[PDB]
Amino acid sequence: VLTQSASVSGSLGQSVTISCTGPNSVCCSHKSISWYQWPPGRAPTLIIYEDNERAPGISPRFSGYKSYWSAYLTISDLRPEDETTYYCCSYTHNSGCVFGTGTKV
Amino acid sequence: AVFLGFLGAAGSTMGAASMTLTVQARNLLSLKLTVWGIKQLQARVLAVERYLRDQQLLGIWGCSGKLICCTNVPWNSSWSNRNLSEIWDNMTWLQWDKEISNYTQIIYGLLEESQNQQEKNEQDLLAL
Amino acid sequence: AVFLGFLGAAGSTMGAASMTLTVQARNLLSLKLTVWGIKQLQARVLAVERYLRDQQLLGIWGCSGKLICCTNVPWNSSWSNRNLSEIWDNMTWLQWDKEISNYTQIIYGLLEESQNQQEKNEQDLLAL
Amino acid sequence: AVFLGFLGAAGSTMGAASMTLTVQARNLLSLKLTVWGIKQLQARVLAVERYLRDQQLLGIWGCSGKLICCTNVPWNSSWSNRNLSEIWDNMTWLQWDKEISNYTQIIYGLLEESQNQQEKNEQDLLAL
Amino acid sequence: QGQLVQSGATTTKPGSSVKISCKTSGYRFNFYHINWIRQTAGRGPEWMGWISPYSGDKNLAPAFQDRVNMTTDTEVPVTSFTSTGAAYMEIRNLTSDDTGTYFCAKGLLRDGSSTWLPYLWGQGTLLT
Numbered sequence: 001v002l003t004q005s006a007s008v009s010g011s012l013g014q015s016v017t018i019s020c021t022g023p024n025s026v027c028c029s030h031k032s033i034s035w036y037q038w039p040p041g042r043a044p045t046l047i048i049y050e051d052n053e054r055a056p057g058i059s060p061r062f063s064g065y066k067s068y069w070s071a072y073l074t075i076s077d078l079r080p081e082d083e084t085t086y087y088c089c090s091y092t093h094n095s096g097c098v099f100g101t102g103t104k105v
Numbered sequence: 106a107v108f109l110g111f112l113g114a115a116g117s118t119m120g121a122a123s124m125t126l127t128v129q130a131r132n133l134l135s136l137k138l139t140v141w142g143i144k145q146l147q148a149r150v151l152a153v154e155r156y157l158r159d160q161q162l163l164g165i166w167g168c169s170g171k172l173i174c175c176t177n178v179p180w181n182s183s184w185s186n187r188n189l190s191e192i193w194d195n196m197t198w199l200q201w202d203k204e205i206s207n208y209t210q211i212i213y214g215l216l217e218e219s220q221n222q223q224e225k226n227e228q229d230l231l232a233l
Numbered sequence: 234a235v236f237l238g239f240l241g242a243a244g245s246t247m248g249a250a251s252m253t254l255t256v257q258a259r260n261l262l263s264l265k266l267t268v269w270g271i272k273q274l275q276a277r278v279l280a281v282e283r284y285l286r287d288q289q290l291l292g293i294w295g296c297s298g299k300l301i302c303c304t305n306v307p308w309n310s311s312w313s314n315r316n317l318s319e320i321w322d323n324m325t326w327l328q329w330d331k332e333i334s335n336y337t338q339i340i341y342g343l344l345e346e347s348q349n350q351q352e353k354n355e356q357d358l359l360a361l
Numbered sequence: 362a363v364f365l366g367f368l369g370a371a372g373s374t375m376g377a378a379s380m381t382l383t384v385q386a387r388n389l390l391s392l393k394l395t396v397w398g399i400k401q402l403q404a405r406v407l408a409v410e411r412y413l414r415d416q417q418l419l420g421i422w423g424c425s426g427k428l429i430c431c432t433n434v435p436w437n438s439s440w441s442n443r444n445l446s447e448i449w450d451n452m453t454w455l456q457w458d459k460e461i462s463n464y465t466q467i468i469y470g471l472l473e474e475s476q477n478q479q480e481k482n483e484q485d486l487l488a489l
Numbered sequence: 490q491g492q493l494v495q496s497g498a499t500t501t502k503p504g505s506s507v508k509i510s511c512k513t514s515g516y517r518f519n520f521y522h523i524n525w526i527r528q529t530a531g532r533g534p535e536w537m538g539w540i541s542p543y544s545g546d547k548n549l550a551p552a553f554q555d556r557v558n559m560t561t562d563t564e565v566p567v568t569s570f571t572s573t574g575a576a577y578m579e580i581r582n583l584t585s586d587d588t589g590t591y592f593c594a595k596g597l598l599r600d601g602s603s604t605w606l607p608y609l610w611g612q613g614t615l616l617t
């Protein structure tokens with residue numbers, strides 16, 4: 001129900017802008033958005049939470065943004081280790097996170 | 106409401122315990138020379154000494170009679186690079202003092218001269 | 234003028250005695266172990282203790298160094314339904330404490346948290 | 362910079378020493394009954410007494426927690442007819458106290474009632 | 490720090506009910522929720538539910554409303570801020586369509602709006 005992006009890529013030095021949106025059920029103005037860097041079949045990683053706040057240790061090139069209808073995840077200054085699958089997820093303070101479909105970068 | 110008591114929020118988050126400061130503030134201060142009498146007199150002079158050393162530092166920082174005073178000394182990230190949400194909504198005041206313990210003397214000087222210079226600036230502004 | 238001396242306005246009206254507060258304020262604080270020496274040492278430690286307990290309450294109310302501080306705690310008429318003119322131009326501070334004595338502990342808590350919350354509000358206002 | 366230490370500017374000009382006040386401010390305050398134990402206990406009770414007498418005068422003047430507070434008492438030239446440049450850029454705090462010593466008690470009363478009346482005026486202004 | 494070692498990656502067949510273990514270290518096990526996340530192959534990653542090692546309160550997705558039993562045992566104090574815990578996961582009407590890698594992840598913060606958020610994950614376990 002939280003339709004992410006199909007996929008895309010850039011190049012070493014450029015940037016990416018992943019998307020994430022849905023209906024009034026899981027998006028957006030009354031929900032927070034978190035983005036997980038999730039290699040397939042491995043331990044995931046919390047990149048940002050609360051729409052744009054990064055986790056401790058996340059590179060400043062990772063940036064989040066939430067419009068009134070869609071949340072974005074920019075990945076500036078690409079590096080080799082960025083070839084992973086990213087997932088957004090929407091949540092409130094007293095619920096669970098409805099993850100997104102997925103996006104191969 | 107809650108009212109956890111004296112030191113009741115010692116295991117609570119720093120942001121939670123920062124709302125019950127009067128609880129610990131009021132318990133910081135409240136002759137025959139026998140073995141018990143000498144013992145009690147030492148407990149009395151020690152309490153007033155410890156209470157006034159903290160009030161002295163609170164004075165040379167421009168924080169007299171304040172439970173929460175804001176300063177002008179910026180936070181050198183070399184002290185703690187943690188963010189606000191992972192400090193006030195995560196750590197407790199006990200473990201916070203455990204990792205800020207090395208730099209507590211560095212900060213106590215920056216607040217001391219920032220107040221000495223501020224009161225010198227305030228006198229210059231009221232000189233007209 | 235007048236200058237009635239230390240406690241000179243103890244029989245005066247509350248509004249009259251409320252103008253001679255510095256008179257009582259300055260007299261609140263001003264080794265051989267003989268029978269007189271132990272006696273004098275007890276008089277010294279007792280005076281500093283009593284003086285600092287009042288300064289402590291004066292601090293957790295936001296009244297540090299104030300002879301007359303105004304608060305934000307409204308006057309619950311169940312404490313005393315008397316009017317202002319029949320209090321300041323009638324009663325003395327002695328008999329006033331006699332009829333407000335039951336509620337003096339209730340008021341001391343309302344002033345304590347009104348200051349804890351005010352300094353929490355002031356930090357939020359200076360956060361921008 | 363400089364940092365002359367505790368009392369390091371005792372021979373410096375009054376304007377120079379007036380910038381190193383925190384240096385002297387922090388050193389104003391920091392049980393077996395043997396001949397040394399009774400000696401040390403007297404040193405402890407004496408330090409807290411002397412420290413609080415100055416903080417008491419600093420309170421009845423509206424100068425709580427201030428290293429430099431400005432008052433409303435004008436300078437009666439009969440105290441010292443010297444000009445500002447021949448005081449702050451000439452005299453030392455030691456010799457200044459030597460020639461202002463007679464009138465130090467006169468000034469201590471003018472500051473005491475100027476604060477008692479100011480807090481009475483502030484209550485009247487917040488009565489609306 | 491913090492670690493969450495998970496159980497073995499053995500396999501069963503439909504109709505059964507397996508238990509998944511998650512052993513914690515390097516952090517107070519009672520201070521953060523424990524989340525259970527599923528990464529199936531024929532579906533997007535799903536959040537199964539979190540449970541409180543401190544309050545025992547559990548909350549899971551309605552897709553696992555009456556099919557999953559989440560339990561945690563009490564912690565073992567190692568130091569003042571370090572303990573060891575364990576979290577357990579079970580399935581009821583189990584088939585072979587729930588095949589995938591299963592993870593356990595502790596909460597993010599102790600307070601705020603991102604309290605339970607799966608922050609620190611385990612290595613995962615392969616299933617049927």
Ligand SMILES: *[C@@H]1O[C@H](CO)[C@@H](O[C@@H]2O[C@H](CO)[C@@H](O[C@@H]3O[C@H](CO[C@H]4O[C@H](CO)[C@@H](O)[C@H](O[C@H]5O[C@H](CO)[C@@H](O)[C@H](O)[C@@H]5O)[C@@H]4O)[C@@H](O)[C@H](O[C@H]4O[C@H](CO)[C@@H](O)[C@H](O)[C@@H]4O)[C@@H]3O)[C@H](O)[C@H]2NC(C)=O)[C@H](O)[C@H]1NC(C)=O
Pocket residue numbers: 093094095109113114116117118519520521522541542543544545546547548596598599600601602603604
């Ligand atoms: C000791 O240490 C423990 C563990 O660290 C502390 O427990 C944690 O406390 C914090 C803050 O109090 C909790 O964060 C809050 O989490 C709630 C989520 O719970 C809500 O949702 C539940 C499931 O949906 C629901 O069952 C709850 O409703 C009642 O039921 C339980 C049954 O056990 C009952 O215990 C509850 O008390 C409820 O009565 C509950 O509604 C979330 O709602 C909070 O968000 C609100 O508050 C924050 C500010 O706190 C605010 O920013 C938000 O906008 C929102 O308004 C908040 O996130 C945490 O869940 C607790 N548990 C952990 C971390 O495991 C404990 O407080 C410490 N005590 C002391 C004295 O130190």
Ligand SMILES: *[C@@H]1O[C@H](CO)[C@@H](O[C@@H]2O[C@H](CO)[C@@H](O[C@@H]3O[C@H](CO[C@H]4O[C@H](CO)[C@@H](O)[C@H](O[C@H]5O[C@H](CO)[C@@H](O)[C@H](O)[C@@H]5O)[C@@H]4O)[C@@H](O)[C@H](O[C@H]4O[C@H](CO)[C@@H](O)[C@H](O)[C@@H]4O)[C@@H]3O)[C@H](O)[C@H]2NC(C)=O)[C@H](O)[C@H]1NC(C)=O
Pocket residue numbers: 237241242244245246
């Ligand atoms: C101890 O307790 C006693 C008794 O309670 C106190 O005495 C009372 O003091 C109050 C305030 O000081 C008095 O209220 C004032 O009353 C005067 C009225 O007196 C005037 O009129 C007289 C007749 O017309 C006149 O003779 C007076 O003139 C002089 O003569 C007498 C001779 O004895 C002399 O004693 C006087 O001192 C005069 O020098 C006098 O002018 C009234 O004028 C006052 O009103 C003014 O002041 C109020 C503020 O106080 C102000 O609001 C008004 O607008 C106005 O400006 C005031 O009402 C009271 O009369 C006294 N007697 C009682 C109550 O029986 C005594 O003060 C207490 N002392 C201590 C130390 O506690």
Ligand SMILES: *[C@@H]1O[C@H](CO)[C@@H](O[C@@H]2O[C@H](CO)[C@@H](O[C@@H]3O[C@H](CO[C@H]4O[C@H](CO)[C@@H](O)[C@H](O[C@H]5O[C@H](CO)[C@@H](O)[C@H](O)[C@@H]5O)[C@@H]4O)[C@@H](O)[C@H](O[C@H]4O[C@H](CO)[C@@H](O)[C@H](O)[C@@H]4O)[C@@H]3O)[C@H](O)[C@H]2NC(C)=O)[C@H](O)[C@H]1NC(C)=O
Pocket residue numbers: 365369370372373374
């Ligand atoms: C103890 O007591 C002594 C004696 O009273 C004090 O010494 C006096 O200190 C004051 C303030 O510090 C001095 O006033 C200043 O005078 C200088 C003039 O010197 C300048 O010019 C020299 C010749 O042109 C030059 O050589 C100097 O340059 C260096 O060389 C000397 C070599 O010895 C070295 O010692 C210097 O330190 C220099 O590094 C020097 O540049 C004048 O420039 C000052 O004016 C500036 O500062 C004032 C404020 O102070 C400001 O208002 C002005 O606008 C301007 O910016 C200032 O007038 C005085 O000359 C000293 N000597 C006396 C009085 O005989 C000593 O300070 C006391 N110490 C303590 C700890 O109490």
Ligand SMILES: *[C@@H]1O[C@H](CO)[C@@H](O)[C@H](O)[C@H]1NC(C)=O
Pocket residue numbers: 180181182183
């Ligand atoms: C932080 O402190 C160190 C010394 O403790 C100093 O060298 C550095 O310049 C400071 N940096 C900032 C940003 O304050």
Ligand SMILES: *[C@@H]1O[C@H](CO)[C@@H](O)[C@H](O)[C@H]1NC(C)=O
Pocket residue numbers: 204205207
């Ligand atoms: C404080 O200093 C000690 C000195 O050995 C060091 O071991 C410790 O890591 C320091 N802590 C911080 C937070 O700098």
Ligand SMILES: *[C@@H]1O[C@H](CO)[C@@H](O)[C@H](O)[C@H]1NC(C)=O
Pocket residue numbers: 308309310311
């Ligand atoms: C006065 O205090 C009583 C309890 O002492 C309380 O029940 C009442 O609501 C208060 N009323 C006002 C007006 O403050």
Ligand SMILES: *[C@@H]1O[C@H](CO)[C@@H](O)[C@H](O)[C@H]1NC(C)=O
Pocket residue numbers: 332333335
């Ligand atoms: C205070 O409490 C006592 C308790 O016996 C009571 O007798 C007295 O009337 C009370 N006074 C007031 C002013 O409420």
Ligand SMILES: *[C@@H]1O[C@H](CO)[C@@H](O)[C@H](O)[C@H]1NC(C)=O
Pocket residue numbers: 436437438439
């Ligand atoms: C100075 O003080 C004297 C008494 O010490 C006084 O008579 C005189 O009026 C005062 N003058 C000024 C200007 O304050």
Ligand SMILES: *[C@@H]1O[C@H](CO)[C@@H](O)[C@H](O)[C@H]1NC(C)=O
Pocket residue numbers: 460461463
């Ligand atoms: C202070 O009083 C003494 C009294 O003998 C006098 O000798 C001295 O000159 C006075 N000093 C001043 C500055 O008035």
Ligand SMILES: *[C@@H]1O[C@H](CO)[C@@H](O)[C@H](O)[C@H]1NC(C)=O
Pocket residue numbers: 558559560
């Ligand atoms: C989970 O398992 C425990 C094992 O003893 C059991 O007691 C408990 O009832 C189970 N939970 C539910 C919801 O049945």
